[PDB]
């Protein structure tokens, strides 16, 4: 689950 | 198309109402209308386009992941596979729409480096969302299109942007995740994240330091 | 229609999958299909139907309120009206879908009292949502149709159910809200909510393990509404 | 802001 940009929410 | 009779300024204004209402599909459809007017997006407008499509595709990616997982843990009946397929098909339509907009209207030889990098990063990103659900010969074509878009954006960001610019940073983040999670190159991935993080500390002194955490957070997960 | 070629049991299963995936539009479409097979719903299936359409219409209602009050906070430029009407038309589309389902398939003379009351309460609730956005002659026919659906549900629940039955309470809660917020009859709202809360208090003894969590929770919302209204 | 049941 590596993070990406932009994030959600 | 559906939005052809509406004024550009009214479409932009309606996209902002839709955002406030958390109606992200309407937001996307309004912004697609605006782009189809054929004029450049301002920085504010690009972000409306980004945010609207990210939320639509975000929801669909999360739903695909829940269903794929139930499908993995359970295989006993075709239903789960059928519904996963259906979500998968809707996801792919959205990605195709975004890529159609980028190739037909947004990606130009002209403009701010920032603008050209933004759109090439979006193109790598939406090819990467396709690669996440793809198999076989199609996956290999999609991986090469993602790579080629990201690489082109990387060339520009390095010749024309500073190492702390959030777009350049986000771009290298996503491309490294692509390397590790999609293109099966942990070597290239790790190197890119470290090099990107390194060249950022060396120009430090915001949205810059989030993305710097994320490069390190990923690196932890990976090594 | 579009779900015509799918097995009833596959539609229920896919509705439960749409629920896990938080795809409430999908989930509603699946339950509509299951209903159109013409067989009665179990308790669990009723609950899938209600959840699907509450989430869909709940998001539309919340969106409509946001735009409505942006349309007032500046009351020109027609963009806010136009988008507000657009969300309004979609909301009416969903209400009409649900009212069509209740009329064509779900509301019958037969079946247990739970099921009868549940469908008629849903009918009142979905006319009430139409009422929230209607004007003129339309509004008056809509309010009258909501009242009549609620009143019939009330008559069955008093004859055939105990006063702490959750469906009974939930009904009386929604009807009291209709009085207060739609029919502009706040004394009627207040007396129904209090009478209801009290009759339920007078029997909290005779309350089921499974029902207790729900019935007490709803008695709590009656208390919270009475506080808001006095 | 009156409460109705079921809640969302």
From Swiss-Prot, chain B:
Record carries keyword Secreted: yes
GO cellular component, one term: nucleus
UniProt xrefs under InterPro entries: 14-3-3, 14-3-3_CS, 14-3-3_dom_sf, 14-3-3_domain, 14-3-3_sigma
Site feature: Interaction with phosphoserine on interacting protein: 61, 128
Molecular function via GO: cadherin binding; identical protein binding; phosphoserine residue binding; protein kinase binding; protein kinase C inhibitor activity; protein sequestering activity
PROSITE patterns: 1433_1, 1433_2
Top-level lineage group: Eukaryota
SMART domains: 14_3_3
Tissue distribution: Present mainly in tissues enriched in stratified squamous keratinizing epithelium.
Record family assignment: Belongs to the 14-3-3 family.
PANTHER family assigned to the protein according to its UniProt record, in alphabetical order: 14-3-3 PROTEIN
The protein, known as: 14-3-3 protein sigma
From Swiss-Prot, chain C:
UniProt cross-references to SMART domains, sorted A to Z: 14_3_3
Disulfide bridge partners, by residue number: none
Site, Interaction with phosphoserine on interacting protein: residue positions: 61, 128
Chief place where the protein resides: cytoplasm
Key word Nucleus present: yes
An annotated GO cellular component: cytosol
Compartments, as annotated in UniProt: Cytoplasm; Nucleus; Secreted
Keyword terms, alphabetized: Cytoplasm, Nucleus, Phosphoprotein, Secreted, Ubl conjugation
MF annotations from Gene Ontology: cadherin binding; identical protein binding; phosphoserine residue binding; protein kinase binding; protein kinase C inhibitor activity; protein sequestering activity
Residues carrying Phosphoserine: 10
Mod. after translation: Ubiquitinated. Ubiquitination by RFFL induces proteasomal degradation and indirectly regulates p53/TP53 activation.
A Gene Ontology biological process term: positive regulation of epidermal cell differentiation
Tissues expressing this chain: Present mainly in tissues enriched in stratified squamous keratinizing epithelium.
Assembly and binders: Homodimer. Interacts with KRT17 and SAMSN1. Found in a complex with XPO7, EIF4A1, ARHGAP1, VPS26A, VPS29 and VPS35. Interacts with GAB2. Interacts with SRPK2. Interacts with COPS6. Interacts with COP1; this interaction leads to proteasomal degradation. Interacts with the 'Thr-369' phosphorylated form of DAPK2. Interacts with PI4KB. Interacts with SLITRK1. Interacts with LRRK2; this interaction is dependent on LRRK2 phosphorylation.
Family: Belongs to the 14-3-3 family.
Functional note: Adapter protein implicated in the regulation of a large spectrum of both general and specialized signaling pathways. Binds to a large number of partners, usually by recognition of a phosphoserine or phosphothreonine motif. Binding generally results in the modulation of the activity of the binding partner. Promotes cytosolic retention of GBP1 GTPase by binding to phosphorylated GBP1, thereby inhibiting the innate immune response. Also acts as a TP53/p53-regulated inhibitor of G2/M progression.
Protein name, as recorded: 14-3-3 protein sigma
Source species of the chain: Homo sapiens (Human)
Encoding gene (name): SFN
UniProtKB/Swiss-Prot annotation, chain D:
Tissue: Expressed in umbilical endothelial cells (at protein level). Abundantly expressed in skeletal muscle and ovary, with lower expression in the heart, placenta, lung, liver, pancreas, spleen, testis and small intestine. Weakly expressed in the brain, thymus, prostate and mucosal lining of the colon.
Post-translational modification note: Phosphorylation by NLK promotes nuclear export and inhibits the transcriptional activity. Phosphorylation on Thr-4 is required for binding 14-3-3 proteins.
Stretches of the chain forming a coiled coil according to its record: none
Localization annotation: Cytoplasm; Nucleus
Sites of Phosphothreonine modification: 4
Superkingdom field: Eukaryota
Entry's induction text: Expression is regulated by KRIT1. Levels of expression also regulated by FOXC1 which binds to a conserved element in the FOXO1 promoter.
Function recorded in the entry: Transcription factor that is the main target of insulin signaling and regulates metabolic homeostasis in response to oxidative stress. Binds to the insulin response element (IRE) with consensus sequence 5'-TT[G/A]TTTTG-3' and the related Daf-16 family binding element (DBE) with consensus sequence 5'-TT[G/A]TTTAC-3'. Activity suppressed by insulin. Main regulator of redox balance and osteoblast numbers and controls bone mass. Orchestrates the endocrine function of the skeleton in regulating glucose metabolism.
Disease entry from the Swiss-Prot or TrEMBL record: Rhabdomyosarcoma 2: A form of rhabdomyosarcoma, a highly malignant tumor of striated muscle derived from primitive mesenchymal cells and exhibiting differentiation along rhabdomyoblastic lines. Rhabdomyosarcoma is one of the most frequently occurring soft tissue sarcomas and the most common in children. It occurs in four forms: alveolar, pleomorphic, embryonal and botryoidal rhabdomyosarcomas.
Stated name of the protein: Forkhead box protein O1
Organism: Homo sapiens (Human)
Higher taxonomy: Eukaryota, Metazoa, Chordata, Craniata, Vertebrata
Residue numbers of the full-length protein present here: 21 to 28 of 655
């Amino acid at each position: 689950r590596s993070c990406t940009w932009p994030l959600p929410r | 198309g559906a939005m052809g009779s509406m004024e550009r300024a009214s479409l932009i204004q309606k996209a902002k109402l839709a955002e406030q209402a958390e109606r992200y599909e309407d937001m996307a459809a309004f912004m697609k209308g605006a782009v189809e007017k054929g004029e450049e997006l301002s920085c504010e407008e690009r972000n409306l386009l980004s945010v609207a499509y990210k939320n639509v595709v975000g929801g669909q990616r999360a739903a695909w992941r829940v269903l794929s997982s139930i499908e993995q843990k359970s295989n006993k009946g075709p239903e789960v596979r059928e519904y996963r397929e259906k979500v998968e098909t809707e996801l792919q339509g959205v990605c195709d729409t975004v890529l159609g907009l980028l190739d037909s209207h947004l990606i130009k030889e002209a403009g701010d480096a920032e603008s050209r990098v933004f759109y090439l990063k979006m193109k790598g990103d939406y090819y990467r969302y396709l690669a996440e659900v793809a198999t076989g010969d199609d996956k290999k074509r999609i991986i090469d299109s993602a790579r080629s878009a990201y690489q082109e954006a990387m060339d520009i960001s390095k010749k024309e942007m500073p190492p702390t610019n959030p777009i350049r940073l986000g771009l290298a983040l996503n491309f490294s995740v692509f390397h590790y999670e999609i293109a099966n190159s942990p070597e290239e991935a790790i190197s890119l994240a470290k090099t990107t993080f390194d060249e950022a500390m060396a120009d430090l002194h915001k949205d810059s330091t989030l993305i710097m955490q994320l490069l390190r957070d990923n690196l932890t997960l990976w090594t």
